[PDB]
Design a protein around this nucleic acid. Structure first.
Lengths: 109, 97, 92, 80, 200, 90, 108, 84, 97
DNA sequence: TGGAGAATCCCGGTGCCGAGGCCGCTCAATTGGTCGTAGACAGCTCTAGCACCGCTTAAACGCACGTACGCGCTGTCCCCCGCGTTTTAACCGCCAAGGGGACTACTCCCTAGTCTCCAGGCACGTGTCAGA
DNA sequence: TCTGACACGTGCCTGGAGACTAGGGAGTATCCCCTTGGCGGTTAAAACGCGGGGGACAGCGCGTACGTGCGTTTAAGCGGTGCTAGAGCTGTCTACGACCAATTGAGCGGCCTCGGCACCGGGATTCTCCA
């Protein structure tokens, strides 16, 4: 009687769980009511941000000649982009390290 | 022979800005954490992940503070960092009144 | 305990197919997804409380993304969210 | 007792080398130990507050993550 | 008395009740015992179901708009924008109605000036439908009474006509540009004017 | 809705010959609203961490210990516990 | 019924317990709000208001002013260590700054 | 109505001197003023952008005081005295 | 005639403008700056008087705090004169870019 | 070291504008009762945290040498402060136009609530491939 | 060249999706206060010029204090065993908080009054600089 169980992420063309985002929005005490398009929109935004981080981290891993994303690659991915560094300015990444930066007055002449 | 004073420091800067390992030893930091937490509550158990998280946070905070300290030392036409650089870099961020 | 690990698998295999990932990297990405979710949801809750609205809709999430995310990131995130909402409302 | 001397001079030197410091004074180490003690006191005090709210005798990684999140020191990788 | 209209006049369609309801003095009897002697200058027409801007578009049968479909000429006050009111009155058939827009008085302006306040020039005293509702002491209780019975408001027979475009409905739909607001030519007391529609 | 009369009552309890201005009362209203928002958000976050759906006096007590500095936290706990004890016994 | 007693009256407070209860219930903080939470939070708010107002009154008395202006609130906050720590990211409008000239700028 | 250009010169040099006098500055270089103008422009853009976003979310044309207060509390610069 | 030494009138101005509570920028140029900044985001935009007053108070307090940090950076470099590098160092340590 | 001149503080009088008290009312707090249900409380499992011993070996510590760097002193000359004069536009008051927002009924779509069910997601065994 | 951490396949389970309803939240429907633009005298303040002085800055000597290297110590770190506090889950039951109906009183808008403080002016007291 009931039709085929089509997920909402397939309707939205997304990969993040629209249903889980809706359930987390309902139980998080954010508002009394939660609209239909808010989990779709939030899942799309989170999927785009995850995609951007994984693009830059995979590029950093390929530059270091290894096929596995380690936390150093995520730290390089975040800090080497200006906008992701602005979004993650107050964020410590564990096993992350720092950028190689030596000032001009410290280098020998 | 004997190297010039400064090139081993530059080599250490280059080799410690590539690794992601933890620079303070585990057991002295664990003993320091337990000694500090003894003042707050008596007979506290600690997860190992709690001490590792405290070590990661403390190392990141000290490295960022040393970057600001180096900027303050370079600003005063120096390469040697001094405690006034640390005090200035902590007062500008608001950590000291 | 629920997490976002298989969806990070799906996104990574979509965009970097011959590239693996570590466990600590997944913990970092899961914490990143949770942090951005809490940021946008708290900003949308504040936007709903300021305007005396008891419903969070796509406009509040869009405005939260415009408030939180930096410029080109905000523009592309609004574009992706608008595409997903139009595709979801178009297909019934 | 003591236990601030376990944060030794080569450890502070290594942290300065990671920060980019070329030369370090001899008065840096005591100041760095004091600053580390202040920071650890703040985070450990908040973590003990979160632990004693939950009626537990064990400080977890969640409590440390939330204590760091309260100060603006958000730490990924430990379940945050 | 002889200066009262009957129900025979209201058996009109939408556009002649828009046209042939001009120059008739709208006289309201508030309980102090005084008259107003106010003559209207412009009206508006709503066809109903085929009119996209009407309240009864597509056969709407809301319980608020209930005093229209039992007889032509039934008066209908409807609340607009919280406190304001507007004067609709039905025509022959269900849906067709005409709206009262603006009037000019010849006497009684002091009482309407006093009752207007909860800056008060004669040009802006009642230049508006909500202005004339607030200047005639009209409340929401006047929906249950018609136009031509007993002692309340009625009309008096008086002694060019320019059609203007619709203003205030937006540039959308298909029925929002038909000229249905007929107003007197050369009057400087018109609230909404049309300087390009006066040349036919 | 504002906290104006309560701030005036507290002011005449503390300094009985000292008044206040409108800008100062607006600032005190903002201070009370900000501290309320801080403590209530902290208590909501604490209840969300410990899987509780209620906000009790314990939640506000550890929220005050989290937010306020040392002597402020100790004394705020002192009159808070005094008020809860007086409320439950009367 | 009996005589209506305010919850602030039986809690010994001047701040409203009921208004804090309503704002906690309508603030979307939790699904339930306990009975002692508005009493406790009203006591904390009353204490902090009294601490700011006592030092503001002292600052107004030191300036020979009966009334409290924003400058007295700024001097009350920025001279106490704990109140300045709590209000470190807060700008008081029409408040000014503390009079602070550095020692190396003063003449010898 | 019209377009407004080059209003950063209205933040005059004596105004920057007076703001530095309140900050405790005894001697001011001549290149301070353009940097202070740029800093003020960056700060005003960052606050007014969030205030405009809060205004456009409410579907209004006027920027209220509460929009600016929310835009500043967004950036950890909470302002007391203009409502809240 | 009479002439004060360089620095006396500056210290008098420091005392005078630290004693006062006024807003130091003229109101109309700051208002016009607010209009020309907001016209790059949304055209046909209106402002209340209190919004411009709030922007002026916040911007003046931010500039006063920045000048305090700039003065301490100048004092750290053995100077009494503030320079653009002082402002750049204070904003870099605070985290502003 | 004394003394002139500018600035600053003190005291007395004037007026105005806003804080502060009073009053009617109405809206939200209080009181009493009922009804589920979240959470206190006891109990049991078994996880992981602590205590301790050995060893081996990398890291830490003390000491010597010395060279680079901080720091005090000195000269100079550039740039900014102080002040006077001139010019610009900010501040105040008044007035008119016009879009924009208060404002409350109404009416309709949309989102919470609930039942059912089934398939996506989580826990766990397997080999297998990248990195030291 | 090994090995251990991640990719892959399988079973159950529980929460998300289809589907229907209820009711309530939000969009929409002229007019008057708010904001903006202009005019115009007034004068406070910005702007420009110029003298000069003092502070930024480059150069130089020196003296010492960290850098670096090496021998010796030492205790971190890894493995292993053992044991018991205490996290974590479950079951039960009951106190407590949401919800609602009637009541009533305290807080809020409106109104009016007089005193605190800003301002002006004259004189006494610092206070800064120069012969």
């Amino acid at each position: 009687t009931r039709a085929k169980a089509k997920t909402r992420s397939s309707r939205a063309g997304l990969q993040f769980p629209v249903g889980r985002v809706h359930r987390l929005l309902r139980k998080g005490n954010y508002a009394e009511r939660v609209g239909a398009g808010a989990p779709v929109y939030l899942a799309a935004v989170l999927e785009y941000l995850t995609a951007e981080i994984l693009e830059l981290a995979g590029n950093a891993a390929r530059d270091n000649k290894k096929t596995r994303i380690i936390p150093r690659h995520l730290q390089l991915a975040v800090r080497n982009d200006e906008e992701l560094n602005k979004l993650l300015g107050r964020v410590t990444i564990a096993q992350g390290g720092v950028l190689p930066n030596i000032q001009s007055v410290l280098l020998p002449k | 022979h004997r190297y010039r004073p400064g090139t081993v420091a530059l080599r250490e800067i280059r080799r410690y800005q590539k690794s992601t390992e933890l620079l303070i030893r585990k057991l002295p930091f664990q003993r320091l954490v337990r000694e500090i937490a003894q003042d707050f509550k008596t007979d506290l158990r600690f997860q190992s992940s709690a001490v590792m998280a405290l070590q990661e946070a403390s190392e990141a905070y000290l490295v960022g503070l040393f970057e600001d300290t180096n900027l303050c030392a370079i600003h005063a036409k120096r390469v040697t960092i001094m405690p006034k650089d640390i005090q200035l870099a902590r007062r500008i961020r608001g950590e000291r009144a | 305990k629920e997490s976002y690990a298989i969806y990070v698998y799906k996104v990574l295999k979509q965009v970097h197919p011959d590239t693996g990932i570590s466990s600590k990297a997944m913990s970092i990405m899961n914490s990143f997804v949770n942090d951005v979710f809490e940021r946008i949801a708290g900003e949308a809750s504040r936007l709903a409380h300021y305007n005396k609205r008891s419903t969070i809709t796509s406009r509040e999430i869009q405005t939260a993304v415009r408030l939180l995310l930096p410029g080109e990131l905000a523009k592309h995130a609004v574009s992706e969210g608008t595409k997903a909402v139009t595709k979801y409302t178009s297909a019934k | 007792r003591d236990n601030i001397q376990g944060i030794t001079k080569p450890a502070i030197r290594r942290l300065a080398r990671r920060g980019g410091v070329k030369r370090i004074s001899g008065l840096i180490y005591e100041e760095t130990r004091g600053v580390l003690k202040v920071f650890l006191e703040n985070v450990i005090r908040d973590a003990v507050t979160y632990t004693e709210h939950a009626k537990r005798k064990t400080v977890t990684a969640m409590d440390v993550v939330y204590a760091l999140k309260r100060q603006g020191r958000t730490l990924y990788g430990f379940g945050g | 008395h002889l200066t009262r209209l009957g129900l025979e006049f209201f058996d009109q369609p939408a556009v002649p009740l828009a046209r042939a309801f001009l120059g008739q003095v709208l006289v309201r009897r508030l309980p102090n015992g005084t008259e107003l002697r106010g003559r209207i200058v412009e009206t508006e027409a709503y066809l109903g179901p085929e009119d996209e801007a009407a309240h009864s578009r597509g056969g709407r049968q809301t319980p608020r708009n209930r005093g229209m479909f039992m007889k032509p000429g039934t008066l209908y006050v409807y609340i607009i924008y919280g406190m304001y009111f507007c004067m609709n009155i039905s025509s022959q058939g269900d849906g067709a109605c005409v709206l009262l827009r603006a009037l000019e008085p010849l006497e009684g302006l002091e009482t309407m000036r006093q009752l207007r306040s909860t800056v008060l020039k004669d040009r802006e005293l009642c230049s508006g439908p909500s202005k004339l509702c607030q200047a005639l002491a009209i409340n929401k209780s006047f929906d249950q009474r018609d136009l031509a019975q007993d002692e309340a408001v009625w009309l008096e027979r008086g002694p060019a006509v320019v059609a203007a475009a619709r203003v205030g409905v937006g540039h959308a739909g298909e029925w929002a540009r038909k000229p249905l607001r007929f107003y007197v030519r050369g009057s400087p007391w018109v609230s909404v004017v049309d300087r390009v529609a006066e040349q036919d």
